[PDB]
């Protein structure tokens, strides 16, 4: 399935925020949120069906799925690992997009933001 029409570029931003010292219950050191958003705000539900965040196996249930904005997963942990972000489209002939993001957690400052720009190339109907 491959389109026969106009091409659409929708820029996006993906990555995580994390805040430190946040332990007795479970030894965890950080809260973090991993996310995908549009570069400029828009209702990304117009074309995104759902976004999967595949976590490290140390998480119970490493497969996380979000279907409505904001496309984010918040968690606590002790470690950095690579997260696979897979974006699925409403249109069944627009193939999914797979992103990879190294979760960053960590000396005086408490918060970290690791954020990348990308672009989804959809193809639109040729109205």
């Amino acid at each position: 399935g491959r389109v026969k029409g106009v091409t659409i570029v929708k820029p996006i931003v993906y990555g995580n925020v994390a805040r430190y010292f946040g332990r007795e219950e479970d030894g965890h050191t950080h809260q973090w949120t991993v996310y995908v958003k549009p570069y400029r705000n828009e209702d990304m539900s117009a074309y995104v069906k759902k976004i999967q965040f595949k976590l490290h196996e140390s998480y119970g249930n490493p497969l996380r799925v979000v279907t409505k904005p904001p496309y984010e997963i918040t968690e606590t942990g002790w470690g950095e690992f690579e997260i696979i972000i897979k974006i699925f489209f409403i249109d069944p002939n627009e193939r999914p997009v797979t992103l990879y993001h190294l979760l960053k957690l960590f000396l005086g400052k408490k918060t970290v933001v690791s954020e990348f720009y990308d672009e989804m190339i959809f193809q639109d109907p040729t109205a």
Binding site: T29, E57, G79, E80, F81, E82, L105
Partner: peptide, 6 residues
């Protein structure tokens, strides 16, 4: 896979 603390 790899997951590493500070």
């Amino acid at each position: 896979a790899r997951k590493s603390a500070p």
